[PDB]
Ligand binder design. Structure first.
Ligand SMILES: Nc1c(-c2nnn[nH]2)cnn1-c1ccc(Cl)cc1Cl
Ligand SMILES: Nc1c(-c2nnn[nH]2)cnn1-c1ccc(Cl)cc1Cl
Length: 263
């Protein structure tokens, strides 16, 4: 049934010069649209959702964990740290680090989440525990964004990430309070208005996490609450052949618009 939407996505991809991956889940009826749904893409900062969620899972057995202070030192600053740099020689709580990672895409904050989980493999272990056999986190910030074509490190597929995002935000992979906290954080994202959201009707409510990296990699993963129907989960991943390619958030908006016009 989805051949027409898939053909429109293929035409968009052809004009973009890059490689596009899309996965939709409509949670009213679990129907789906996939485009390169089982191909691997570099996650870049979209991986911050899995790290924050893994810390939320830890907080289910430690009521005070999100209030736990974490030291920020000058040597911890990496390549984009708009929140963490204000706290150097001080501390941020795990809640503050989660909010900074998710809503501002702070890369130092992501590294503190990764360290709280015991390294990149602790994020992967959480993914496995919630049923995601595809996600892999191999490196910290900033090197997880190298996005080299053919490199499996720090990748997932659109199908797997859409299913995981659904289970984290609308399903029961997290406890109820933790799920609500993750949704609140995503809905408060500051970085998403040019990506999936730009392709959807302005009245719809969106929570999302963007990512970008080398090879012009431009990504967005979103939960969408349209008016008058059950929520959708949409992943759009895009990567290009040249290491220094520019970001193409407009391609993600165009993919989202094709999806919305097919509903
Ligand atoms: N561009 C991004 C993202 C990002 N998140 N979502 N989409 N992109 C996260 N970190 N950075 C980044 C990296 C290096 C420099 Cl110098 C500046 C920035 Cl802002
Ligand atoms: N995926 C499906 C089915 C379907 N029926 N049985 N299994 N799947 C029917 N409609 N769609 C669909 C959903 C979203 C968009 Cl945008 C476009 C389409 Cl054509």
């Amino acid at each position: 049934q989805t051949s027409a939407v898939q053909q429109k996505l293929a035409a968009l991809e052809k004009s973009s010069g890059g490689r596009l991956g899309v996965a939709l889940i409509d949670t009213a009826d679990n129907t789906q649209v996939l485009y390169r749904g089982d191909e691997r893409f570099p996650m870049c900062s979209t991986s911050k959702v899995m790290a924050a969620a893994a810390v939320l899972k830890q907080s289910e057995t430690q009521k005070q964990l999100l209030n736990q202070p974490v030291e920020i030192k000058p040597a911890d600053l990496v390549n984009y740290n708009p929140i963490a740099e204000k706290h150097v020689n001080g501390t941020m709580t795990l809640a503050e680090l989660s909010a900074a990672a998710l809503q501002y895409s702070d890369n130092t904050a992501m590294n503190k989440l990764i360290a709280q989980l015991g390294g990149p493999g602790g994020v992967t272990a959480f993914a496995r525990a919630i049923g995601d056999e595809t996600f892999r986190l191999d490196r910290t910030e900033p090197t997880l964004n190298t996005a080299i074509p053919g490199d499996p490190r720090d990748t997932t597929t659109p199908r797997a990430m859409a299913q995981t995002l659904r289970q984290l935000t609308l399903g029961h992979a997290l406890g109820e309070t933790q799920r609500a906290q993750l949704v609140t954080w995503l809905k408060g994202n500051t970085t998403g208005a040019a990506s999936i959201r730009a392709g959807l009707p302005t009245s719809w409510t969106v929570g999302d996490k963007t990512g970008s990296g080398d090879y012009g990699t431009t990504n967005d993963i979103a939960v969408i609450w349209p008016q008058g129907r059950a929520p959708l989960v949409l992943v759009t991943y895009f990567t290009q052949p040249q290491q220094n390619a520019e970001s193409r958030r407009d391609v993600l908006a165009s993919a989202a618009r094709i999806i919305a016009e097919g509903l």
